Amino acid sequence: MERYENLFAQLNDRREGAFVPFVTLGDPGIEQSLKIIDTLIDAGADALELGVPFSDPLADGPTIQNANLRAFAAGVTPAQCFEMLALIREKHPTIPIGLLMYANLVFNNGIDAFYARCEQVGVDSVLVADVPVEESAPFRQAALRHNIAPIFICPPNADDDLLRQVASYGRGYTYLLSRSGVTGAENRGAPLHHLIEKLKEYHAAPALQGFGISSPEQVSAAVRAGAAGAISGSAIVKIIEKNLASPKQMLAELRSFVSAMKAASRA
Amino acid sequence: TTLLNPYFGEFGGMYVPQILMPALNQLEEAFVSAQKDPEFQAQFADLLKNYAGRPTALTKCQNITAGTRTTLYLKREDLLHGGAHKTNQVLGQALLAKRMGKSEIIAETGAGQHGVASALASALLGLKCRIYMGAKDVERQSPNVFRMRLMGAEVIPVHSGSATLKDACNEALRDWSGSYETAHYMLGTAAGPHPYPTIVREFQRMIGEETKAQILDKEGRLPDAVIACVGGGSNAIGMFADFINDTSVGLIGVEPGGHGIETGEHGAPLKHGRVGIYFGMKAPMMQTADGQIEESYSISAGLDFPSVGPQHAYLNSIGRADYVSITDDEALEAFKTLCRHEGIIPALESSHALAHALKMMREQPEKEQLLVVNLSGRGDKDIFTVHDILKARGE
Ligand SMILES: O=P(O)(O)OCCNS(=O)(=O)c1ccc(OC(F)(F)F)cc1
Ligand SMILES: *Cc1c(COP(=O)(O)O)cnc(C)c1O
Ligand SMILES: [Cl-]
Ligand SMILES: [Cl-]
Ligand SMILES: [Cl-]
Ligand SMILES: [Cl-]
Ligand SMILES: [Cl-]
Ligand SMILES: [Cl-]
Ligand SMILES: [Cl-]
Ligand SMILES: [Cl-]
Ligand SMILES: [Cs+]
Ligand SMILES: [Cs+]
Ligand SMILES: [Cs+]
Ligand SMILES: [Cs+]
Ligand SMILES: [Cs+]
Ligand SMILES: [Cs+]
Numbered sequence: 001m002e003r004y005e006n007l008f009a010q011l012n013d014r015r016e017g018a019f020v021p022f023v024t025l026g027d028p029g030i031e032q033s034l035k036i037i038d039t040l041i042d043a044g045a046d047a048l049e050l051g052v053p054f055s056d057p058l059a060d061g062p063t064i065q066n067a068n069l070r071a072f073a074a075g076v077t078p079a080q081c082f083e084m085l086a087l088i089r090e091k092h093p094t095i096p097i098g099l100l101m102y103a104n105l106v107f108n109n110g111i112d113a114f115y116a117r118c119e120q121v122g123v124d125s126v127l128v129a130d131v132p133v134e135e136s137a138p139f140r141q142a143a144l145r146h147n148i149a150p151i152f153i154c155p156p157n158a159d160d161d162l163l164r165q166v167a168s169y170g171r172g173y174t175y176l177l178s179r180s181g182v183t184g185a186e187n188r189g190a191p192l193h194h195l196i197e198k199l200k201e202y203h204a205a206p207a208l209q210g211f212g213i214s215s216p217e218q219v220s221a222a223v224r225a226g227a228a229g230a231i232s233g234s235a236i237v238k239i240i241e242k243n244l245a246s247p248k249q250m251l252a253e254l255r256s257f258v259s260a261m262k263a264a265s266r267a
Numbered sequence: 268t269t270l271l272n273p274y275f276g277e278f279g280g281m282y283v284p285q286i287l288m289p290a291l292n293q294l295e296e297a298f299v300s301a302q303k304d305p306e307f308q309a310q311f312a313d314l315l316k317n318y319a320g321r322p323t324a325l326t327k328c329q330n331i332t333a334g335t336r337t338t339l340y341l342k343r344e345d346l347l348h349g350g351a352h353k354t355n356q357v358l359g360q361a362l363l364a365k366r367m368g369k370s371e372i373i374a375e376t377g378a379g380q381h382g383v384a385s386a387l388a389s390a391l392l393g394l395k396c397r398i399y400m401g402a403k404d405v406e407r408q409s410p411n412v413f414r415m416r417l418m419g420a421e422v423i424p425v426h427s428g429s430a431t432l433k434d435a436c437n438e439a440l441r442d443w444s445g446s447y448e449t450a451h452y453m454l455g456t457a458a459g460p461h462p463y464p465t466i467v468r469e470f471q472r473m474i475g476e477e478t479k480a481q482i483l484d485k486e487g488r489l490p491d492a493v494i495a496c497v498g499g500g501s502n503a504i505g506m507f508a509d510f511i512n513d514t515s516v517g518l519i520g521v522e523p524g525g526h527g528i529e530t531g532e533h534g535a536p537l538k539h540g541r542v543g544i545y546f547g548m549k550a551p552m553m554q555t556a557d558g559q560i561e562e563s564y565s566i567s568a569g570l571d572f573p574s575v576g577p578q579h580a581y582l583n584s585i586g587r588a589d590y591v592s593i594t595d596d597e598a599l600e601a602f603k604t605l606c607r608h609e610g611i612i613p614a615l616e617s618s619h620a621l622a623h624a625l626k627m628m629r630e631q632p633e634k635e636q637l638l639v640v641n642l643s644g645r646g647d648k649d650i651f652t653v654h655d656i657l658k659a660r661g662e
Contacts, residue, residue, distance in 0.1 A: 065427045129284055132281065134281055135280055180447075
């Protein structure tokens with residue numbers, strides 16, 4: 001499929017940025033996670049980034065460390081996540097769905113087979129957080145064989161060689177890292193228009209800015225700097241954490257937040 | 268692009284977030300440069316000799332082998348400053364941090380020996396040291412935590428995941444992912460992303476180099492085999508390295524068998540785990556069927572790293588080195604045996620290596636064999652553990 005290509009073309013026609021929330025699949029349980037994800041979509045999410053709970057999420061700050069832990073407390077497994085993904089796709093035909101994986105979960109039962117399962121359930125991209133471009137070959141090859149976009153990370157300090165590598169190898173979108181460190185709403189990061197311009201020159205996949213995005217102004221700023229949109233994770237997951245005791249209020253606050261963030265992306 | 272091969276066959280690599288690749292490249296370049304720098308080598312040798320106390324003794328253990336055709340020597344890393352071999356490589360890495368212009372150190376620790384070793388090196392060399400330690404390990408390793416604090420280190424409990432060593436490993440990398448411009452990550456074993464398996468081997472290889480010179484002096488030949496316990500692989504690769512090209516010398520690594528391999532409660536990933544990708548490397552590891560990282564169980568807390576260095580997995584694959592396991596009960600008997608018959612209290616880690624050597628002797632007592640066991644540390648730290656076991660079984 002061409003779900004990201006279609007999305008960005010449609011957004012471009014509206015001079016509009018993409019807003020893309022992250023959540024952990026199965027946080028705080030399968031049923032509530034499914035309702036969370038439908039809420040994010042109804043409230044205006046343009047695409048999703050979805051985490052499979054992993055024992056060792058070493059690119060994630062405490063907020064998302066805790067999301068993984070809550071899903072584990074609910075007994076969530078990768079197999080159940082793939083069941084979730086199939087159902088999400090059966091409800092929602094065009095929204096791009098990207099996974100946030102760690103390498104062991106992809107390599108575990110064979111890299112090719114992992115990407116084949118992604119294709120079967122209707123996933124559009126995979127970002128493997130602990131696989132740098134230097135190690136990417138078997139992952140990106142398997143992704144492309146299975147019509148999955150391999151998502152590459154562009155650090156805010158990327159030199160020309162790295163930009164050319166990310167531009168050539170990536171598809172779907174290019175992940176423009178706001179800053180060094182790990183995920184978290186506490187630390188606000190990026191001064192990225194230089195990278196944005198070079199990625200465009202090299203015909204990279206459109207850039208989405210991520211890490212530390214927690215406010216509408218940051219979404220607006222990302223689009224103004226020339227990015228195609230913005231990803232927000234910790235800010236969304238914090239609403240889950242804060243509202244565990246009231247699933248109704250959780251959904252209401254998620255809706256409000258996503259609505260505001262998406263509004264910031266509009267022309 | 269790297270200066271050195273990041274792989275040992277299929278094993279190893281640099282499986283870190285993209286943000287950390289410049290830190291690994293910087294470290295590799297600094298290492299390659301330092302290895303060619305006689306001033307660096309002189310400074311390292313000076314610390315090893317005058318601060319840590321190298322060379323360490325090679326002791327012939329006659330009582331233990333009486334009436335057999337085994338001759339057994341122990342390489343006495345138990346006598347190194349700090350009481351374990353870990354001191355060698357933390358001094359080298361502290362010097363690399365300084366070479367790069369860094370004044371801060373990050374370290375992970377499980378049982379606490381690496382934290383203590385990192386803290387002592389940092390105190391000596393004027394580096395500000397912070398140590399991550401799973402909260403469950405903090406609670407159970409009060410002596411080591413206090414030692415680290417006495418030495419001026421900051422000890423930070425890690426509450427995420429399983430609250431143990433692997434979780435501390437993660438936290439160290441999370442910190443470094445933001446702080447690498449001013450901080451060096453002082454990894455504690457011959458594992459993790461390149462260039463750490465290479466650096467740690469090279470900064471531990473004096474164990475085997477000394478052993479070779481000492482055995483030639485005393486015996487006029489090479490050993491039939493050198494035997495070392497394998498947690499993450501640093502002491503074993505430090506013993507093995509200088510003998511790799513000596514094809515007649517057996518290289519035997521001993522993983523913890525815990526309550527028994529068949530129970531699943533062990534720490535022997537190289538022979539009984541499954542290759543995965545974690546902690547920056549492709550290597551055998553303890554993991555669930557669906558790919559979650561598991562814990563290594565041993566009576567010896569120091570053998571709980573849930574994977575193994577990639578060079579060991581490679582040496583096994585080509586049949587250069589052989590890997591075996593020793594259970595908690597076998598390790599305990601070896602510990603008691605060495606105390607009673609040689610007056611040396613061995614670390615329970617090291618007791619796994621000794622136990623395998625004792626098995627080699629006892630199984631075939633008329634086989635002529637010249638063995639060296641790497642006595643990786645002293646066992647003062649283990650006396651409460653041992654006391655508690657002997658009392659519970661009614662000895
Ligand atoms: O809003 P924040 O600060 O929580 O950031 C959320 C990001 N979630 S994600 O899936 O895009 C994401 C993207 C990349 C990550 O690591 C990597 F860069 F090393 F690959 C980790 C998570
Ligand atoms: C740390 C430790 C070990 C295990 O770590 P390796 O990296 O495998 O050497 C073994 N023995 C002692 C005494 C230790 O302190
Ligand atoms: Cl697409
Ligand atoms: Cl849709
Ligand atoms: Cl899978
Ligand atoms: Cl090379
Ligand atoms: Cl390779
Ligand atoms: Cl002589
Ligand atoms: Cl031999
Ligand atoms: Cl006592
Ligand atoms: Cs595999
Ligand atoms: Cs591209
Ligand atoms: Cs706007
Ligand atoms: Cs000495
Ligand atoms: Cs003898
Ligand atoms: Cs091991």
